[PDB]
Structure 1
Amino acid sequence: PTGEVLSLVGKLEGTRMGDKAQRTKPQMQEERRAKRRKRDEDRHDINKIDETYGVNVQFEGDEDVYGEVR
């Protein structure tokens, strides 16, 4: 059996195309929901250079972090 790959014609009637084809799930859904909830909380709360050397802040795809369909 391992010598060569058998032709599909013999086992064609075994099953159908995409018999075990399952759709995918979104990634970081919980994190996106948390970001959306925090942003909505801030939104409804809003609606309702010193001489120090270290004063300046430390200034260190296609995924919607906010989780809202623009």
Structure 2
Amino acid sequence: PTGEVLSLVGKLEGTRMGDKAQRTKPQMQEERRAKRRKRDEDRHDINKMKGYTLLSEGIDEM
């Protein structure tokens, strides 16, 4: 059994090209999820008061 590598001609019968391929997953998926969750929580105040044009809004003073 020499170490020579052998031509693949005639040795592809049992296999396809897309077989064994794999597609990755978003790196730090959960860390980014947590960062976005914290950002949403801390920015909830900014979002809530964003569209409230106070002069034209009568509930802001409350």
TM class, shorter-length: 0.5 to 0.7
Q: Which runs of 5+ in 2 are unaligned?
A: 49-62
If the length of structure 1 is used for normalisation, what is the TM-score? 0.58
Q: Distance in 2 between matches of 1:33 and 1:4?
A: 49
Higher relative contact order (CA 8 A, sep 6+): 1
Q: Which runs of 5+ in 1 are unaligned?
A: 49-70
Q: Distance in 1 between matches of 2:16 and 2:7?
A: 16
If the length of structure 2 is used for normalisation, what is the TM-score? 0.64
4+ aligned runs moved over 4 Å, structure 1: none
RMSD, aligned α-carbons:
1.5
- Count residues with an aligned counterpart: 48
Q: Distance in 2 between matches of 1:47 and 1:19?
A: 47
Q: Distance in 2 between matches of 1:2 and 1:23?
A: 35
